[PDB]
């Protein structure tokens, strides 16, 4: 079974860029309700229970035609991702390795945030929108996707994630997604995180060269 | 240039500068080959190599330098070229480590008290309790304080007894599956024979993220390092390659490390069921070469591809996109019980006109009492022949057929009713034609199910098209249907330019132009000189006369 | 040039199934924002003159949906989900509605039941529909020669996102929007008490007659 | 010539460019030995590419009333004929009915 | 091999099926396919869930060399994708219910 | 497809790929506090300090430079300092300043081995007469595949000697077969 | 010829053999079914029915 | 000399190496494929008859486009396109007209006709273009080819496969083609003498029966079978083989 995680910040602590009330909504009955559904799935199955949480997914995925326990454990995943995706005083500029793993994969960083806006201004109903690294390419990249749907079924590390579900932002924006996902890189995304993601992504992708003798 | 093409080779092929130890020979005949064919040798390095000829200018040489002839042996094997940079492994943060039982426990086909379970699965949830940093000072219990009495681990302590029982009852046979299926011990493999010590740990006592501590064993160049971590089955850091050319200097056999385990796996389907990770030292800058899947064994029992590749997660047997659409397609509605159906049904018309040529046969016994001739075997039921007909050996195949699973009265009764029916006409001066017999009826109603099936799954694929396409999910199974230009990039098609001798025409000797003018003797000695008057459908000669009768 | 209507009942009409903040900010700011972007794509294209059924039928594409198919879809959705709601709505509905419903669910119970649940398993936006079986394939071979009359029945489905029944030749008849936009701002996640609130205060059950007759028709000048 | 199957290798001593832009041809500035590394043949085996990979152990070797009409396929218990090799080509004439009705015991010509 | 068929195919069985689970799921309202000793090469490109009252059927998957045992009062879910062949020995019905993306 | 088909149930070596060969016997051969054991140490959980749900318990001197925030620049230790944590949320060391960790199996606490602050390398090529030692056979002309304890295994292969101007036919790592150029 | 030193004429007699078996008939085919210009008289022969007779001297 | 292709290089007057080589059918029709100096490739079938590669390539109807991509030198074809053979290689017939204009050096414009290639067929296709089955085998394994053993022809893949290799053994890539090697040769026994008399024979014996044909239809008369054939045919082809060919000697 798999416990509710908190945030790692109090949930007023995004004020006034995200309003407690849709903390107390999208994590007290909206992650909750993941979490517990998820745990009754697992207390009948003994063979979904052992898996990992990235196994679990993957496992329930089944290949494009996903089990009935996919939506419940992959959107665990995704809501415990996305409050470490966020800080209280984020946004401004990532340092040091993300800094240049973003100028190297995107050209530069104001090109990295226009093609991550346009991921999430595009993604038509609810999905979500991410920041990986290719696992084969060992590239950065910017990949959209809908419902409980996480870039771990393609076996890529996430590094940011952001919400672009309806209940996520329909108190304090409403339908106003636009500023909604600019104000979201701008006060609240956390690149401590994505330094800390892409050092545990280090342990598998190896985005170095390799020092080659001269003989 | 050459700079960039050693950097290829390295990255793409593998190449690597591994040192050569030679013996005397083959160091003088690279040293002074290089001057030329028969020149006096001026570079002392060949001079060098010509005195090392003899073992005993070499015997004196390792006098003069004053160390004995062993460890110049050993000199030999020292690794060339330039060396790493150090290893600092920086631990992030202190190693806050928790007792928590394995996720997968018990094992399957092993029954446990549930409520036990339950309790120890209690545990599990304790990963979503946080721990920061700043908070491991308020009670931290130092000395007699921390002692393991002290502590609280009921539900490890109920895995444990629960882990006990298992292995004392499960020890065996696991040794005895493993002799069976193992021929030879590998690194991986379980530690069996007189090489087993009690109290080794089995797999269930395992679980990803736990952190170990180890020696390194064995160091395999196309596989990676083995540790042992205290448990029946060796662990296993994938590294192969370039990669051993730098990481030899650190990887060791003997040194104890911090592994971490990644992935925990079968051991009849795997053949490394532990895969670690170093935690200490950190290699991962190093670690280039990766395995695209774990390897697995191919047992005597595996003999379907698509059965192993779904017992590990390997992707299915790929093959050409067939580029039709499984929705355009039309429906299906030939129900493959309706020749079964055909046969009994021409198996009763046929019964049914033997008994009305010779009816005294039939005499004194019932018809649905009737018995099969001594030798009747319903596994033959199918037998393929070949038969001449007009100067032909056509091909026949033989349909045997009981009388149990035809319905004769039925049968006699709806011929009886023909036949008394054609009397009449015949009384009448007219002729009566029957549309379609009860099986023909019964051959259609089966195909109004399978058609029916037919209809409804083509809705309910419409219906998964439709959600699919709003939802980005895959169409057919990933892994099958590749794109053109996979199989290989000569493909031999007929249909092409640069496949077809037709340019000409076709060759008066090529095998067409044989069939071709065959048929048209075929079809003179049935038509001959005259000329097509028209030509219309089947269906339209289905259609036409219906209305004209 | 396809333009936004009002719904036909007051903003204030609806209290206290849907407020009208939710009321007017569903309708002026989603649907309306969605006429609006359909009206800017089909400026100057194929798509200028054709009814809006035909705007989503051809937009679809038999799978690989052209990039107006979403607003479109979402604009004749929104407007569908309008006409399916009254202040006078709920209970229950009579005649061969009603025979209907209890030929293809058994009991009016049964089929409601069955729709809560089909609306609260809906993951994700979209919608769930009841729609009148009147279907036509694309292939050949796909006509019945003997229809039994009950292959023309009412059957529940759900969509994801913009998707509605007539793709699949199918004849809406009554709707719920289960995007979390609908009712957040009244519900929030409470999506059961929303459900039970529509379909016991706001089912208009004169209009799913009415369209249930209007598909009758039509699968009746398609006999012929 | 190779004296045995293999994988060839070699450390220092020989170009890694090859001597032209499309060719597998090396030169050796230098003396050096050409390693030639043993493994066993796949040879006509057919393989998967799919489960068999890197170091994957192998413990194995590598009257129409009797008549009826389906997909493709039709069955006759109006006279047929049948080709001697029993192959059709496209477009062949097999059963060809004579009609009683068009039969004259005369003669003349027919027009058209 | 070690691991059956049922596992690695993903079919779920439910096998004597209670009554709560055949009226929750409305089978009794579902249609009949019928059939005799016959072969059926069928691949499943979308959900099907199947109930067997008489008759029996051997599944063998494409390639392989053994077989799933289904008895009457069974419960079957043939997964999307299945290419196996099916194999009756008898006369045989069932009652069916295709299912599209989530639904049930 | 299955649906357009027109058998009855009732009734050694490795592979090696980079182009397939296949190691074997025919080409690889050998030549040649309570007691403290190796086992696990428990399992590690995730510290919120490092916004990882996997701790990543070590840095290398490519990754602390890339991926160490400012804040975190106090928590990195040159050695091992192991805590536990039990069900109750109680944290217990026993010493601060040592190498302490619990046996899961025992239930009993030990020291650590180091406090984490031979002649044959892997990789290399041999002569066919190459000596190690004067008690030891000579060694066979191979790559050293396999290093253990006190043996190693030779993957055999057969050097040719070129003289400069030399053209060798292939590319590293290239499959030849018997009687190539 | 395996095991024995095989006959000298054997080459001979096992190339006339062929010749008698696949011969004629590859060659008996490929006889174009003659016709006139009017397509009038067909002329056509029937390979499967060639014969060979035991000489008379 | 067995049926296949021969790959050959023979020094000119300055020592220039020259690579070549040379198709050989069943029928010892030989197909030179040639090297010159600006690296041009001539389809040469006789001692003046020359032929580029290109249009005997578009002769049989191989666009321009696919030619460049099957090879690994795209560069080297195109080089060599000068815009007058460029428009009759676009069109398929231009390049038959082009390519009978070269092999038969014949002054002035043919016509496109059936009878042309009828023409061209029996004297270049029927006896420079048919492996045969011995000649496939030999292409099928010199040219490293997957091709099924039936196809008894020479398909256009296999000239464009053999330019591969010519152009890059130039390069160091493979070997000689060992002309006096047994494996490059074949063994006529009685059979194939005997066969191939059989072959004149039936031969001679159409142009009995249409010279018989047509005289019986000029009179109007029904010939039975037996009179529209005589057995001069083969006898006497028979009795001239023995008699006259080398190959038949007296028993000594
Ligand atoms: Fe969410
Ligand atoms: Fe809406």
Same mark, same amino acid.
């Given at each position: +079974? +798999?416990?509710?995680?908190?945030?790692?910040?109090?949930?007023?602590?995004?004020?006034?860029?995200?309003?407690?009330?849709?903390?107390?909504?999208?994590?007290?009955?909206?992650?909750?309700?993941?979490?517990?559904?998820?745990?009754?799935?697992?207390?009948?199955?003994?063979?979904?229970?052992? +898996?990992?949480?990235?196994?679990?997914?993957?496992?329930?995925?089944?290949?494009?035609?996903?089990?009935?326990?996919?939506?419940?454990?992959?959107?665990?995943?995704?809501?415990?991702?996305?409050?470490?995706?966020?800080?209280?005083?984020?946004?401004?500029?990532?340092?040091?390795?993300?800094?240049?793993?973003?100028?190297?994969?995107?050209?530069?960083?104001?090109?990295?945030?226009?093609?991550?806006?346009?991921?999430?201004?595009?993604?038509?109903?609810?999905?979500?929108?991410?920041?990986?690294?290719?696992?084969?390419?060992?590239?950065?990249?910017?990949?959209?996707?809908?419902?409980?749907?996480?870039?771990?079924?393609?076996?890529?590390?996430?590094?940011?994630?952001?919400?672009?579900?309806?209940?996520?932002?329909?108190?304090?924006?409403?339908?106003?997604?636009?500023?909604?996902?600019?104000?979201?890189?701008?006060?609240?995304?956390?690149?401590?995180?994505?330094?800390?993601?892409?050092?545990?992504?280090?342990?598998?992708?190896?985005?170095?060269?390799?020092?080659?003798?001269?003989? | 240039?050459?700079?960039?093409?050693?950097?290829?080779?390295?990255?793409?092929?593998?190449?690597?500068?591994?040192?050569?130890?030679?013996?005397?020979?083959?160091?003088?005949?690279?040293?002074?080959?290089?001057?030329?064919?028969?020149?006096?040798?001026?570079?002392?390095?060949?001079?060098?190599?010509?005195?090392?000829?003899?073992?005993?200018?070499?015997?004196?040489?390792?006098?003069?330098?004053?160390?004995?002839?062993?460890?110049?042996?050993?000199?030999?094997?020292?690794?060339?070229?330039?060396?790493?940079?150090?290893?600092?492994?920086?631990?992030?943060?202190?190693?806050?480590?928790?007792?928590?039982?394995?996720?997968?426990?018990?094992?399957?086909?092993?029954?446990?008290?549930?409520?036990?379970?339950?309790?120890?699965?209690?545990?599990?949830?304790?990963?979503?309790?946080?721990?920061?940093?700043?908070?491991?000072?308020?009670?931290?219990?130092?000395?007699?304080?921390?002692?393991?009495?002290?502590?609280?681990?009921?539900?490890?302590?109920?895995?444990?007894?629960?882990?006990?029982?298992?292995?004392?009852?499960?020890?065996?046979?696991?040794?005895?599956?493993?002799?069976?299926?193992?021929?030879?011990?590998?690194?991986?493999?379980?530690?069996?024979?007189?090489?087993?010590?009690?109290?080794?740990?089995?797999?269930?006592?395992?679980?990803?993220?736990?952190?170990?501590?180890?020696?390194?064993?064995?160091?395999?160049?196309?596989?990676?390092?083995?540790?042992?971590?205290?448990?029946?089955?060796?662990?296993?850091?994938?590294?192969?390659?370039?990669?051993?050319?730098?990481?030899?200097?650190?990887?060791?056999?003997?040194?104890?490390?911090?592994?971490?385990?990644?992935?925990?796996?079968?051991?009849?389907?795997?053949?490394?069921?532990?895969?670690?990770?170093?935690?200490?030292?950190?290699?991962?800058?190093?670690?280039?070469?990766?395995?695209?899947?774990?390897?697995?064994?191919?047992?005597?029992?595996?003999?379907?591809?698509?059965?192993?590749?779904?017992?590990?997660?390997?992707?299915?047997?790929?093959?050409?996109?067939?580029?039709?659409?499984?929705?355009?397609?039309?429906?299906?509605?030939?129900?493959?019980?309706?020749?079964?159906?055909?046969?009994?049904?021409?198996?009763?018309?046929?019964?049914?006109?033997?008994?009305?040529?010779?009816?005294?046969?039939?005499?004194?016994?019932?018809?649905?009492?009737?018995?099969?001739?001594?030798?009747?075997?319903?596994?033959?039921?199918?037998?393929?022949?070949?038969?001449?007909?007009?100067?032909?050996?056509?091909?026949?195949?033989?349909?045997?057929?009981?009388?149990?699973?035809?319905?004769?009265?039925?049968?006699?009764?709806?011929?009886?009713?023909?036949?008394?029916?054609?009397?009449?006409?015949?009384?009448?001066?007219?002729?009566?034609?029957?549309?379609?017999?009860?099986?023909?009826?019964?051959?259609?109603?089966?195909?109004?199910?399978?058609?029916?099936?037919?209809?409804?799954?083509?809705?309910?694929?419409?219906?998964?098209?439709?959600?699919?396409?709003?939802?980005?999910?895959?169409?057919?199974?990933?892994?099958?249907?590749?794109?053109?230009?996979?199989?290989?990039?000569?493909?031999?098609?007929?249909?092409?330019?640069?496949?077809?001798?037709?340019?000409?025409?076709?060759?008066?000797?090529?095998?067409?132009?044989?069939?071709?003018?065959?048929?048209?003797?075929?079809?003179?000695?049935?038509?001959?000189?005259?000329?097509?008057?028209?030509?219309?459908?089947?269906?339209?000669?289905?259609?036409?006369?219906?209305?004209?009768? | 040039?396809?333009?936004?209507?009002?719904?036909?009942?007051?903003?204030?009409?609806?209290?206290?199934?849907?407020?009208?903040?939710?009321?007017?900010?569903?309708?002026?700011?989603?649907?309306?924002?969605?006429?609006?972007?359909?009206?800017?794509?089909?400026?100057?294209?194929?798509?200028?003159?054709?009814?809006?059924?035909?705007?989503?039928?051809?937009?679809?594409?038999?799978?690989?949906?052209?990039?107006?198919?979403?607003?479109?879809?979402?604009?004749?959705?929104?407007?569908?989900?309008?006409?399916?709601?009254?202040?006078?709505?709920?209970?229950?509905?009579?005649?061969?509605?009603?025979?209907?419903?209890?030929?293809?669910?058994?009991?009016?119970?049964?089929?409601?039941?069955?729709?809560?649940?089909?609306?609260?398993?809906?993951?994700?936006?979209?919608?769930?529909?009841?729609?009148?079986?009147?279907?036509?394939?694309?292939?050949?071979?796909?006509?019945?020669?003997?229809?039994?009359?009950?292959?023309?029945?009412?059957?529940?489905?759900?969509?994801?996102?913009?998707?509605?029944?007539?793709?699949?030749?199918?004849?809406?008849?009554?709707?719920?929007?289960?995007?979390?936009?609908?009712?957040?701002?009244?519900?929030?996640?409470?999506?059961?008490?929303?459900?039970?609130?529509?379909?016991?205060?706001?089912?208009?059950?004169?209009?799913?007659?009415?369209?249930?007759?209007?598909?009758?028709?039509?699968?009746?000048?398609?006999?012929? | 010539?190779?004296?045995?199957?293999?994988?060839?290798?070699?450390?220092?001593?020989?170009?890694?460019?090859?001597?032209?832009?499309?060719?597998?041809?090396?030169?050796?500035?230098?003396?050096?030995?050409?390693?030639?590394?043993?493994?066993?043949?796949?040879?006509?085996?057919?393989?998967?590419?799919?489960?068999?990979?890197?170091?994957?152990?192998?413990?194995?070797?590598?009257?129409?009333?009797?008549?009826?009409?389906?997909?493709?396929?039709?069955?006759?218990?109006?006279?047929?004929?049948?080709?001697?090799?029993?192959?059709?080509?496209?477009?062949?004439?097999?059963?060809?009915?004579?009609?009683?009705?068009?039969?004259?015991?005369?003669?003349?010509?027919?027009?058209? | 091999?070690?691991?059956?068929?049922?596992?690695?195919?993903?079919?779920?069985?439910?096998?004597?099926?209670?009554?709560?689970?055949?009226?929750?799921?409305?089978?009794?309202?579902?249609?009949?396919?019928?059939?005799?000793?016959?072969?059926?090469?069928?691949?499943?490109?979308?959900?099907?869930?199947?109930?067997?009252?008489?008759?029996?059927?051997?599944?063998?998957?494409?390639?392989?060399?053994?077989?799933?045992?289904?008895?009457?009062?069974?419960?079957?879910?043939?997964?999307?994708?299945?290419?196996?062949?099916?194999?009756?020995?008898?006369?045989?019905?069932?009652?069916?219910?295709?299912?599209?993306?989530?639904?049930? | 497809?299955?649906?357009?088909?027109?058998?009855?149930?009732?009734?050694?070596?490795?592979?090696?790929?980079?182009?397939?060969?296949?190691?074997?016997?025919?080409?690889?051969?050998?030549?040649?506090?309570?007691?403290?054991?190796?086992?696990?140490?428990?399992?590690?959980?995730?510290?919120?300090?490092?916004?990882?749900?996997?701790?990543?318990?070590?840095?290398?001197?490519?990754?602390?430079?890339?991926?160490?925030?400012?804040?975190?620049?106090?928590?990195?230790?040159?050695?091992?300092?192991?805590?536990?944590?039990?069900?109750?949320?109680?944290?217990?060391?026993?010493?601060?300043?040592?190498?302490?960790?619990?046996?899961?199996?025992?239930?009993?606490?030990?020291?650590?081995?180091?406090?984490?602050?031979?002649?044959?390398?892997?990789?290399?090529?041999?002569?066919?007469?190459?000596?190690?030692?004067?008690?030891?056979?000579?060694?066979?002309?191979?790559?050293?595949?396999?290093?253990?304890?006190?043996?190693?295994?030779?993957?055999?292969?057969?050097?040719?000697?070129?003289?400069?101007?030399?053209?060798?036919?292939?590319?590293?790592?290239?499959?030849?077969?018997?009687?190539?150029? | 010829?395996?095991?024995?030193?095989?006959?000298?004429?054997?080459?001979?007699?096992?190339?006339?053999?062929?010749?008698?078996?696949?011969?004629?008939?590859?060659?008996?085919?490929?006889?174009?079914?003659?016709?006139?210009?009017?397509?009038?008289?067909?002329?056509?022969?029937?390979?499967?029915?060639?014969?060979?007779?035991?000489?008379?001297? | 000399?067995?049926?296949?292709?021969?790959?050959?290089?023979?020094?000119?007057?300055?020592?220039?190496?020259?690579?070549?080589?040379?198709?050989?059918?069943?029928?010892?029709?030989?197909?030179?494929?040639?090297?010159?100096?600006?690296?041009?490739?001539?389809?040469?079938?006789?001692?003046?008859?020359?032929?580029?590669?290109?249009?005997?390539?578009?002769?049989?109807?191989?666009?321009?486009?696919?030619?460049?991509?099957?090879?690994?030198?795209?560069?080297?074809?195109?080089?060599?396109?000068?815009?007058?053979?460029?428009?009759?290689?676009?069109?398929?017939?231009?390049?038959?007209?082009?390519?009978?204009?070269?092999?038969?050096?014949?002054?002035?414009?043919?016509?496109?006709?059936?009878?042309?290639?009828?023409?061209?067929?029996?004297?270049?296709?029927?006896?420079?273009?048919?492996?045969?089955?011995?000649?496939?085998?030999?292409?099928?394994?010199?040219?490293?080819?997957?091709?099924?053993?039936?196809?008894?022809?020479?398909?256009?893949?296999?000239?464009?496969?053999?330019?591969?290799?010519?152009?890059?053994?130039?390069?160091?890539?493979?070997?000689?083609?060992?002309?006096?090697?047994?494996?490059?040769?074949?063994?006529?026994?009685?059979?194939?003498?005997?066969?191939?008399?059989?072959?004149?024979?039936?031969?001679?014996?159409?142009?009995?029966?249409?010279?018989?044909?047509?005289?019986?239809?000029?009179?109007?008369?029904?010939?039975?079978?037996?009179?529209?054939?005589?057995?001069?045919?083969?006898?006497?082809?028979?009795?001239?083989?023995?008699?006259?060919?080398?190959?038949?000697?007296?028993?000594?």
């Amino acid at each position: +079974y +798999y416990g509710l995680k908190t945030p790692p910040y109090p949930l007023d602590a995004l004020e006034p860029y995200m309003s407690q009330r849709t903390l107390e909504v999208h994590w007290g009955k909206h992650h909750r309700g993941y979490v517990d559904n998820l745990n009754k799935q697992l207390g009948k199955d003994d063979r979904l229970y052992g +898996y990992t949480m990235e196994e679990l997914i993957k496992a329930t995925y089944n290949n494009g035609n996903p089990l009935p326990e996919f939506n419940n454990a992959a959107q665990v995943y995704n809501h415990d991702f996305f409050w470490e995706s966020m800080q209280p005083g984020g946004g401004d500029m990532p340092i040091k390795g993300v800094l240049e793993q973003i100028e190297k994969d995107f050209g530069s960083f104001t090109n990295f945030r226009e093609k991550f806006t346009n991921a999430a201004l595009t993604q038509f109903g609810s999905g979500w929108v991410w920041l990986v690294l290719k696992r084969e390419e060992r590239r950065l990249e910017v990949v959209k996707t809908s419902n409980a749907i996480n870039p771990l079924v393609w076996d890529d590390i996430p590094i940011i994630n952001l919400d672009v579900w309806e209940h996520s932002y329909y108190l304090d924006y409403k339908n106003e997604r636009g500023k909604y996902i600019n104000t979201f890189l701008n006060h609240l995304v956390s690149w401590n995180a994505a330094m800390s993601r892409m050092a545990r992504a280090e342990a598998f992708v190896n985005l170095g060269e390799p020092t080659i003798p001269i003989a | 240039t050459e700079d960039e093409a050693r950097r290829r080779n390295w990255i793409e092929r593998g190449w690597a500068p591994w040192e050569e130890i030679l013996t005397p020979e083959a160091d003088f005949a690279r040293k002074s080959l290089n001057e030329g064919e028969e020149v006096p040798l001026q570079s002392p390095e060949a001079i060098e190599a010509f005195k090392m000829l003899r073992p005993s200018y070499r015997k004196k040489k390792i006098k003069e330098m004053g160390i004995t002839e062993d460890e110049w042996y050993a000199k030999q094997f020292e690794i060339r070229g330039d060396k790493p940079p150090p290893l600092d492994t920086s631990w992030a943060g202190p190693l806050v480590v928790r007792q928590i039982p394995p996720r997968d426990w018990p094992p399957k086909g092993w029954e446990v008290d549930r409520k036990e379970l339950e309790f120890i699965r209690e545990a599990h949830k304790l990963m979503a309790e946080r721990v920061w940093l700043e908070d491991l000072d308020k009670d931290l219990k130092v000395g007699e304080d921390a002692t393991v009495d002290k502590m609280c681990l009921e539900r490890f302590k109920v895995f444990l007894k629960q882990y006990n029982e298992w292995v004392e009852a499960n020890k065996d046979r696991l040794e005895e599956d493993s002799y069976k299926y193992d021929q030879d011990f590998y690194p991986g493999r379980r530690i069996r024979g007189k090489d087993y010590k009690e109290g080794m740990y089995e797999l269930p006592f395992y679980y990803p993220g736990m952190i170990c501590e180890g020696t390194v064993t064995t160091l395999h160049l196309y596989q990676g390092a083995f540790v042992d971590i205290g448990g029946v089955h060796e662990g296993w850091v994938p590294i192969k390659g370039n990669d051993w050319f730098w990481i030899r200097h650190f990887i060791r056999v003997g040194m104890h490390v911090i592994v971490e385990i990644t992935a925990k796996r079968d051991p009849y389907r795997f053949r490394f069921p532990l895969e670690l990770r170093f935690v200490h030292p950190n290699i991962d800058h190093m670690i280039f070469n990766k395995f695209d899947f774990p390897p697995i064994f191919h047992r005597d029992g595996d003999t379907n591809p698509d059965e192993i590749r779904r017992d590990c997660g390997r992707p299915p047997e790929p093959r050409k996109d067939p580029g039709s659409k499984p929705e355009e397609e039309g429906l299906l509605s030939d129900h493959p019980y309706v020749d079964k159906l055909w046969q009994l049904h021409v198996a009763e018309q046929m019964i049914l006109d033997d008994y009305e040529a010779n009816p005294e046969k039939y005499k004194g016994k019932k018809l649905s009492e009737l018995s099969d001739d001594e030798g009747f075997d319903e596994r033959k039921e199918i037998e393929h022949g070949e038969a001449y007909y007009k100067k032909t050996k056509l091909p026949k195949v033989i349909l045997k057929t009981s009388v149990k699973e035809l319905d004769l009265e039925a049968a006699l009764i709806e011929r009886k009713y023909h036949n008394k029916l054609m009397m009449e006409a015949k009384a009448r001066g007219e002729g009566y034609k029957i549309e379609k017999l009860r099986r023909n009826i019964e051959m259609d109603e089966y195909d109004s199910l399978h058609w029916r099936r037919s209809l409804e799954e083509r809705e309910a694929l419409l219906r998964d098209i439709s959600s699919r396409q709003a939802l980005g999910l895959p169409l057919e199974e990933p892994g099958r249907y590749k794109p053109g230009s996979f199989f290989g990039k000569d493909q031999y098609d007929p249909t092409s330019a640069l496949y077809q001798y037709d340019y000409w025409g076709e060759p008066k000797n090529s095998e067409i132009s044989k069939q071709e003018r065959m048929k048209d003797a075929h079809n003179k000695s049935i038509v001959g000189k005259g000329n097509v008057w028209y030509d219309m459908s089947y269906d339209d000669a289905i259609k036409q006369t219906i209305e004209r009768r | 040039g396809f333009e936004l209507k009002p719904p036909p009942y007051p903003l204030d009409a609806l209290e206290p199934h849907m407020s009208r903040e939710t009321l007017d900010y569903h309708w002026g700011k989603h649907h309306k924002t969605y006429v609006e972007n359909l009206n800017k794509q089909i400026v100057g294209t194929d798509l200028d003159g054709l009814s809006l059924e035909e705007v989503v039928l051809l937009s679809y594409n038999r799978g690989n949906m052209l990039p107006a198919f979403n607003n479109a879809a979402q604009a004749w959705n929104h407007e569908f989900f309008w006409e399916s709601i009254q202040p006078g709505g709920g209970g229950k509905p009579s005649g061969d509605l009603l025979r209907l419903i209890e030929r293809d669910f058994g009991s009016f119970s049964d089929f409601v039941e069955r729709f809560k649940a089909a609306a609260a398993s809906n993951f994700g936006s979209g919608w769930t529909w009841l729609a009148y079986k009147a279907n036509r394939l694309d292939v050949a071979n796909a006509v019945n020669p003997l229809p039994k009359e009950e292959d023309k029945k009412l059957v529940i489905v759900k969509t994801p996102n913009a998707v509605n029944p007539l793709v699949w030749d199918y004849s809406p008849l009554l709707t719920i929007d289960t995007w979390e936009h609908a009712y957040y701002l009244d519900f929030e996640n409470r999506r059961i008490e929303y459900i039970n609130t529509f379909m016991e205060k706001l089912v208009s059950w004169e209009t799913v007659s009415t369209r249930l007759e209007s598909a009758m028709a039509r699968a009746a000048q398609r006999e012929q | 010539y190779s004296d045995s199957e293999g994988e060839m290798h070699w450390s220092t001593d020989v170009s890694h460019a090859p001597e032209f832009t499309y060719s597998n041809v090396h030169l050796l500035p230098k003396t050096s030995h050409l390693w030639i590394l043993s493994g066993g043949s796949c040879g006509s085996s057919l393989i998967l590419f799919s489960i068999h990979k890197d170091q994957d152990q192998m413990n194995i070797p590598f009257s129409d009333l009797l008549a009826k009409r389906r997909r493709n396929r039709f069955l006759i218990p109006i006279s047929v004929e049948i080709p001697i090799n029993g192959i059709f080509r496209r477009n062949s004439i097999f059963a060809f009915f004579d009609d009683p009705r068009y039969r004259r015991k005369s003669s003349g010509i027919l027009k058209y | 091999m070690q691991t059956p068929l049922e596992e690695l195919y993903n079919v779920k069985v439910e096998r004597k099926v209670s009554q709560r689970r055949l009226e929750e799921l409305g089978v009794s309202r579902w249609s009949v396919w019928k059939t005799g000793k016959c072969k059926l090469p069928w691949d499943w490109q979308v959900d099907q869930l199947v109930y067997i009252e008489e008759g029996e059927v051997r599944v063998v998957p494409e390639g392989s060399k053994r077989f799933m045992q289904f008895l009457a009062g069974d419960l079957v879910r043939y997964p999307k994708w299945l290419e196996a062949d099916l194999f009756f020995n008898a006369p045989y019905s069932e009652r069916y219910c295709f299912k599209a993306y989530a639904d049930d | 497809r299955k649906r357009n088909n027109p058998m009855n149930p009732f009734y050694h070596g490795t592979i090696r790929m980079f182009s397939l060969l296949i190691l074997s016997s025919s080409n690889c051969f050998r030549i040649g506090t309570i007691k403290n054991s190796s086992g696990p140490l428990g399992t590690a959980i995730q510290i919120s300090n490092f916004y990882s749900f996997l701790p990543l318990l070590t840095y290398n001197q490519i990754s602390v430079i890339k991926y160490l925030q400012l804040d975190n620049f106090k928590y990195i230790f040159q050695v091992i300092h192991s805590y536990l944590i039990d069900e109750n949320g109680r944290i217990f060391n026993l010493d601060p300043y040592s190498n302490l960790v619990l046996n899961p199996f025992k239930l009993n606490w030990y020291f650590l081995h180091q406090n984490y602050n031979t002649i044959i390398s892997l990789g290399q090529f041999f002569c066919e007469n190459v000596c190690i030692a004067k008690k030891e056979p000579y060694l066979k002309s191979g790559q050293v595949l396999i290093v253990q304890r006190d043996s190693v295994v030779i993957r055999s292969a057969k050097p040719y000697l070129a003289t400069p101007g030399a053209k060798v036919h292939g590319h590293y790592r290239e499959i030849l077969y018997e009687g190539d150029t | 010829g395996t095991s024995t030193i095989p006959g000298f004429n054997q080459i001979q007699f096992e190339g006339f053999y062929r010749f008698i078996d696949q011969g004629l008939i590859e060659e008996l085919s490929k006889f174009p079914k003659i016709e006139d210009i009017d397509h009038e008289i067909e002329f056509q022969l029937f390979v499967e029915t060639y014969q060979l007779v035991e000489p008379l001297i | 000399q067995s049926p296949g292709i021969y790959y050959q290089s023979e020094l000119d007057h300055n020592g220039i190496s020259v690579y070549t080589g040379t198709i050989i059918s069943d029928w010892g029709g030989r197909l030179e494929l040639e090297i010159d100096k600006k690296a041009r490739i001539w389809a040469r079938v006789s001692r003046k008859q020359k032929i580029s590669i290109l249009v005997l390539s578009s002769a049989m109807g191989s666009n321009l486009r696919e030619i460049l991509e099957n090879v690994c030198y795209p560069e080297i074809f195109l080089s060599f396109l000068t815009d007058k053979e460029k428009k009759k290689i676009g069109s398929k017939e231009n390049a038959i007209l082009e390519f009978y204009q070269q092999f038969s050096c014949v002054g002035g414009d043919p016509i496109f006709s059936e009878s042309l290639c009828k023409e061209l067929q029996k004297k270049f296709f029927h006896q420079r273009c048919e492996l045969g089955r011995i000649g496939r085998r030999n292409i099928n394994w010199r040219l490293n080819l997957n091709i099924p053993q039936n196809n008894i022809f020479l398909l256009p893949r296999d000239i464009l496969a053999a330019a591969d290799h010519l152009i890059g053994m130039k390069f160091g890539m493979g070997t000689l083609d060992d002309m006096n090697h047994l494996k490059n040769k074949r063994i006529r026994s009685v059979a194939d003498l005997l066969q191939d008399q059989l072959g004149l024979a039936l031969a001679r014996l159409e142009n009995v029966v249409k010279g018989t044909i047509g005289g019986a239809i000029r009179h109007k008369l029904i010939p039975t079978p037996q009179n529209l054939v005589t057995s001069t045919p083969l006898t006497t082809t028979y009795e001239s083989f023995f008699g006259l060919h080398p190959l038949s000697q007296v028993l000594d």
